A = this chain, B = another copy of it.
Amino acid sequence: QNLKSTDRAVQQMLDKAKREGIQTVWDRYEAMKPQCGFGETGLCCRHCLQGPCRINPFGDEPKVGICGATAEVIVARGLDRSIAAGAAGHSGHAKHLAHTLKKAVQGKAASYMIKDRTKLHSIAKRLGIPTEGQKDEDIALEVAKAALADFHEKDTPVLWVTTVLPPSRVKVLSAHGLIPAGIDHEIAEIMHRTSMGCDADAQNLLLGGLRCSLADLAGCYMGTDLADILFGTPAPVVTESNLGVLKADAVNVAVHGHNPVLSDIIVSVSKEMENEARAAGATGINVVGICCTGNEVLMRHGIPACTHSVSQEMAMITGALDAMILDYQCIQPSVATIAECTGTTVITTMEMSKITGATHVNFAEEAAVENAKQILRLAIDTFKRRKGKPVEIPNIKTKVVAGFSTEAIINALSKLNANDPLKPLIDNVVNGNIRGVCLFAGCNNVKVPQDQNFTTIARKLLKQNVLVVATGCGAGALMRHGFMDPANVDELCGDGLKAVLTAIGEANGLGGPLPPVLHMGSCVDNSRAVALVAALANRLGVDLDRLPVVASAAEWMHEKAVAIGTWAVTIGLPTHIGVLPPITGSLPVTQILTSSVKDITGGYFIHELDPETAADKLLAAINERRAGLGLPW
């Protein structure tokens, strides 16, 4: 079980699943070995009915696609479609929120409102929307319309790119024709250019993919902006994570997926109906989070994080999960089958994301509170059915300090310098107390023992005084292994980094340091890390590709993460990836993504499967950036 997951709670449930004969993601992975080498290297194409075509990585025929498509065209086309699909996921999430805000300020969905008025006003002015002398509802309606307008061509490029990056970065990207003209416009253009008999030049294709990855960046940043307006900007909070946050005597309700439009309401309504849940024999309604929508409500409300990503089925295996409430993205469809064995009520809520065998509850913002009631009443009903059943909840949980929005980080720094809050951070970068900054992002992947890369790389960087921030299931991995607990700062952090986390935490009325890793939220909240390092760049008067800042998608899986890794490279960051995407079948494509893209954007991918080597390479990249500033290292 150790080779499957480094999480001891996950290992315990893996033993339970094995003895009850419940097939898991790891069993399904084992049944799939050896995986197809053509698909693993990227040398397969099904873009037309003359296929499927493949290309031998080495040896004799086939050496070329039936239409004449070369290995480098086929590899670049497949990558582009992955970026476009990721963009479409983050795009759809942000679009849903844009519609939710518009409905709310037009009086159509009273369950939603402008919760963060100061974020609303700062966004409107970043966009150049006039605020002075306007109702909030009219400013918000303007912001929502501007959001929806970034999805298509108009007289301006995508403002959720051009107004969020340093102007020097925007100029460099414009010179290469990489600024998106519209979010869905770019997605559609990728799908066109990669279809049969279209674009057949690897470099041209990859440039289109960089541009589409910035459409994904725009979607993430818009998603974060809109969610903060509607639901509040995160501020530091304390909670717990891992399976031990389930309680045998409560109605345990998992919010799972990505979009909090639904799960933020479930959080609110669940408070009301705990009276209704005592009547069924529960202590209350124990809302817990899985994946990114769990991160959303953990970041805003302190909802304990139950589990993440590859291990999401294990929460059900406890026998104590009465309902799991789905919106979309990263939901293993196996949960619908597994629930027949574990008793859990699996509920889908979104029209374009249903799973055969799960109960569907049509959710609409106009009727959000009634929907939450209907769903939570199914959860309460399920809790009654398993009264007197034995459950096996592993007694394993960690303390999690989270909620580090960019606004919260700046506010926390302002206690050391009120008029120049970024200067203390830059000060300790310059003098070596902070070697640099590393963002961990992305998913877990069944190919990698769960959390192994995240924790191994994090341990090394923290010892070397790197300030580590994390999002999505990367934050999930670190939070479940204690990296978000301030009690662990002495163990994990080098003395320079320790000094800075202590100084900031003490000045923020804590008596104790900041946690070893700053949790910056969900996957769309990778945009928060952009807003932070962009402000650092603007305060220093340099571009992002001169900052000692790197990223690591240490165990990535989803097309969304492929898009994120690509826009990390596109905005100038050295970007480590811990699972090879299907590009090794083309040396020219691999060479562009790991080397020569440096000459376009200043960022580059770092392909490294071994996490100890990965950390060395990430430290080397941080130290090259320090040298380019003339800093000691």
Contact = CB atoms under 8 A, between A and B. Distances in A.
A236 interface: no
Given A44-B39, A151-B185, A188-B184, A28 B195 contact: no
A61 B334 contact: no
A36 interface: yes
A305 interface: no
Nearest to A330: B197
A491 interface: no
A558 to B, nearest CB: 5
B333 A200 contact: yes
15 contacts: A25-B68, A29-B50, A39-B44, A49-B445, A68-B334, A68-B336, A85-B192, A88-B188, A88-B195, A89-B195, A187-B187, A192-B328, A195-B560, A200-B354, A200-B355
Contacts of A446: 50, 66
Nearest to A337: B68
A452 to B, nearest CB: 16
A36 to B, nearest CB: 5
B151 A46 contact: no
B85 A195 contact: yes
Interface in A581-613: 581-582
Nearest to A46: B39
A368 interface: no
A40 B52 contact: yes
Given A32-B53, A91-B192, A184-B187, 16 more contacts: A28-B62, A29-B50, A36-B44, A39-B51, A40-B52, A47-B85, A48-B558, A49-B447, A49-B556, A69-B333, A88-B190, A184-B184, A187-B187, A195-B558, A199-B328, A199-B354
A374 interface: no
A29 to B, nearest CB: 5
A520 interface: no
A332 interface: yes
Contacts of A32: 53-54, 61-62, 66
A189 B352 contact: yes
Interface string A164-184: 000000000000010000111
Copy total for this chain: 2
Interface in A209-257: none
Contacts of A331: 197-198, 200
B333 A73 contact: yes
Contacts of A91: 188, 192
B51 A333 contact: no
A29 B66 contact: yes
A31 B61 contact: yes
Interface of A: 25, 28-29, 31-32, 35-36, 38-40, 44, 46-54, 61-70, 73, 78, 81, 84-89, 91-92, 148, 151-153, 177, 182-185, 187-202, 204, 208, 328-337, 351-356, 445-447, 556-560, 562, 579, 581-582
Among A47, A196, A579, chain B packs the most CB atoms within 10 A around the CB of A196
Contacts of A78: 46
A84 B53 contact: no
Contacts of A51: 35, 39
A557 B68 contact: no
Nearest to A208: B352
Given A92-B189, A191-B85, A191-B187, A559 B48 contact: yes
Contact of A558 (B152, B183, B197): B197
A600 to B, nearest CB: 16
Given A52-B35, A188-B188, A329 B197 contact: yes
A173 B320 CA distance: 43
A153 B195 CA distance: 25
Contact of A336 (B54, B200, B355, B356): B200
Given A185-B184, A355-B201, A333 B92 contact: no
A25 B66 contact: yes
Nearest to A561: B49
A191 B579 contact: no
Nearest to A555: B49
A552 to B, nearest CB: 15
